[PDB]
Subunit: 64 residues, 12 copies
Amino acid sequence: VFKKVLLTGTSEESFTAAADDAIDRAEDTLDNVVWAEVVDQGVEIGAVEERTYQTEVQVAFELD
Amino acid sequence: VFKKVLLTGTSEESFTAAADDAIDRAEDTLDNVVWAEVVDQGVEIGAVEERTYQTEVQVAFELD
Amino acid sequence: VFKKVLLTGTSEESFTAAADDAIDRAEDTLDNVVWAEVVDQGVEIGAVEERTYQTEVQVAFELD
Amino acid sequence: VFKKVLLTGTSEESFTAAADDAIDRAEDTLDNVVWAEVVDQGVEIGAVEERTYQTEVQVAFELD
Amino acid sequence: VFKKVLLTGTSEESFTAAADDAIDRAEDTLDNVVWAEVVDQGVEIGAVEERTYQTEVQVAFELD
Amino acid sequence: VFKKVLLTGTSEESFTAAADDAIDRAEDTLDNVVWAEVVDQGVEIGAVEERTYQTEVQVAFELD
Amino acid sequence: VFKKVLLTGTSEESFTAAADDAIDRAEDTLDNVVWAEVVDQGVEIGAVEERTYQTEVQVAFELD
Amino acid sequence: VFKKVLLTGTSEESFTAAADDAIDRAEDTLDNVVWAEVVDQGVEIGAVEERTYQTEVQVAFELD
Amino acid sequence: VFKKVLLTGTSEESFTAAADDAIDRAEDTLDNVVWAEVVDQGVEIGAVEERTYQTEVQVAFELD
Amino acid sequence: VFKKVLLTGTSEESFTAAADDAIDRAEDTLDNVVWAEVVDQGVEIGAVEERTYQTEVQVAFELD
Amino acid sequence: VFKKVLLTGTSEESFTAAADDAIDRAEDTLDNVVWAEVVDQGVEIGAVEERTYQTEVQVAFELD
Amino acid sequence: VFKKVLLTGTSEESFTAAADDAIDRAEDTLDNVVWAEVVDQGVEIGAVEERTYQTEVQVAFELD
Ligand SMILES: [Cl-]
Ligand SMILES: [Cl-]
Ligand SMILES: [Cl-]
Ligand SMILES: [Cl-]
Ligand SMILES: [Mg+2]
Ligand SMILES: [Mg+2]
Ligand SMILES: [Mg+2]
Ligand SMILES: [Mg+2]
Ligand SMILES: [Mg+2]
Ligand SMILES: [Mg+2]
Ligand SMILES: [Mg+2]
Ligand SMILES: [Mg+2]
Ligand SMILES: [Mg+2]
Ligand SMILES: [Mg+2]
Ligand SMILES: [Mg+2]
Ligand SMILES: [Mg+2]
Ligand SMILES: [Mg+2]
Ligand SMILES: [Mg+2]
Ligand SMILES: [Mg+2]
Ligand SMILES: [Mg+2]
Ligand SMILES: [Mg+2]
Ligand SMILES: [Mg+2]
Ligand SMILES: [Mg+2]
Ligand SMILES: [Mg+2]
Ligand SMILES: [Mg+2]
Ligand SMILES: [Mg+2]
Ligand SMILES: [Mg+2]
Ligand SMILES: [Mg+2]
Ligand code: NA
Ligand code: NA
Ligand code: NA
Ligand code: NA
């Protein structure tokens, strides 16, 4: 059985590095992370000093 | 990093109050709730005495 | 077996009251109405004196 | 010919009143506003003292 | 309030039995599981000796 | 000209048998049923003793 | 209150004429037909001597 | 950089001629119109003497 | 078994004639073409002297 | 690099067996078939003596 | 009230840099740009000497 | 007439470089590749030593 958690990673450098930020967080607290699906991307501008890239992923992990 | 939980709130008064019912529940058990996205709405009729409005939301919260 | 009819309700007050207007109509002419799913919302402005809220629902009813 | 502008209205009271906030703004600066389609709804929580309801609409107006 | 968890069940026999595999897992660890919505289906071929059917479901459960 | 009716069939055995339950009902009351498109699938759990599979179909029939 | 019926019109000439074929049928049997939304288009080739264009529409009519 | 404007053209003859009606309007007031994407089609019936075909397009133009 | 190929036809006259341009090409090189589904439409303007209508279709053919 | 082919399998028994019919065909003519994604399901009724279940899949295979 | 403009940025280096190209343009001519949502990505190949990455964004800005 | 092939490119560096990996493969075996549309992105984690970025594209090429 797999389960997915819906995480948004952020990076001031790229959409790829924001996806990696969400996956790193998942791997700190979950075992058996097996793949992530991008479901959305965006850029925070007003609320920040530097633009922040956001990549939202479903991060799948195998249960047991 | 943000994470989202997928909650359906209910209200016998309105779609807005059913969204608030899901967000109140999230805020009772999560810190740093930052925003909710509506993803679906519906109305329970058969199973109930009064119509019940349902508003399903992804409730985002900032991790740490 | 359930069947759905695709109805748009209208209200000069709210999206919730326009959903109720479609469901009331379904319950006047159908037995066993069991739930409704919102599929669209909009507001009539040009063609009317007051703004009219519209909420389109699939209204499900149990057949027999 | 119709044209649409993509506006997000906000309200501390309801999704209906946030849709009206976007339409009022359109009517202050456009002639011949004829109807609006809801395309998204959400609630601002972290960044505000009171929850703020948001209703994003395509606001259509007739050109000439 | 309902909450949903996003699970993928697997079966070497059918899409129905893979949906049941995700729901059985949910019922082992959650109380008040009330319904599941299929959101995707697929078949693992390369990585396995027998084809494995996968049925991904949002499994809804009533909170309290 | 074809017309479609939106029916949900149920079965305690499989998604295929729930699609057949909706089509059998259509064929009892409509002439010239020509094909069905699956548009959704789900499983009733809380409200029932046995899980019930549901397969919602647009059932197309040729008019005349 | 509006209701919609889901009809597919056919024409050996164009997608526009197949939409008109579905609307003409609706107007033969319904009062107060007010507008149609195209939801799909396709072309029958194998089963026919001439290609047949198909335009599927939700045909809305005002109830009363 | 391209920008898109969301226009609905109308024609009493065809969906193609309603798309052309939106593009002609864009070309009267914009320089460098480069392509249009159809996003919706429909037919006005109740409000008019003749059926009016509508084709909504994103009309893209190159900025500078 | 059916297979589909994803083709975009073009025409300087109509969306219907651009769909026919993709289907004619499929029938020149495939046997047993049985039907086509429209999946997108657009109009080339900048790159051409006359507007060119484009209709993208999945063209299905029966294998053997 | 993976490539996908879009195949519809058929079965007079189930949606699972129609998915297997498309995958078997892919494996007869392609090397390195690695997984399939269901994208649509339907049932042929008018044109046949027995109902025929159809399951359309993108069948992915690894290139080289 | 927020408004969105639909811009496509281009870059010969990355999807992230094409999103930044659309946002920079928005910030040259709009005040209060607050965030952008990616809605599409693609790559121009035939018409150019170097591949050009394109990232289309809705760029939101706060009105007043 | 254009045709599209559905390819997934992979890269251990970025989503942009995985899109380029699919396009390079298309250009090795097809003439007249003219543009690619991103349709999905994801990251392989479990099955690999380094994360692998995947970008799935429809790669369009002009036929003749
Ligand atoms: Cl989710
Ligand atoms: Cl419907
Ligand atoms: Cl838009
Ligand atoms: Cl495809
Ligand atoms: Mg930096
Ligand atoms: Mg987002
Ligand atoms: Mg009350
Ligand atoms: Mg729901
Ligand atoms: Mg009043
Ligand atoms: Mg509507
Ligand atoms: Mg107040
Ligand atoms: Mg929004
Ligand atoms: Mg076995
Ligand atoms: Mg999946
Ligand atoms: Mg049994
Ligand atoms: Mg359902
Ligand atoms: Mg003729
Ligand atoms: Mg169809
Ligand atoms: Mg005329
Ligand atoms: Mg429209
Ligand atoms: Mg000519
Ligand atoms: Mg296209
Ligand atoms: Mg048999
Ligand atoms: Mg199909
Ligand atoms: Mg360079
Ligand atoms: Mg694009
Ligand atoms: Mg490296
Ligand atoms: Mg994928
Ligand atoms: Na989730
Ligand atoms: Na219907
Ligand atoms: Na717009
Ligand atoms: Na394809």
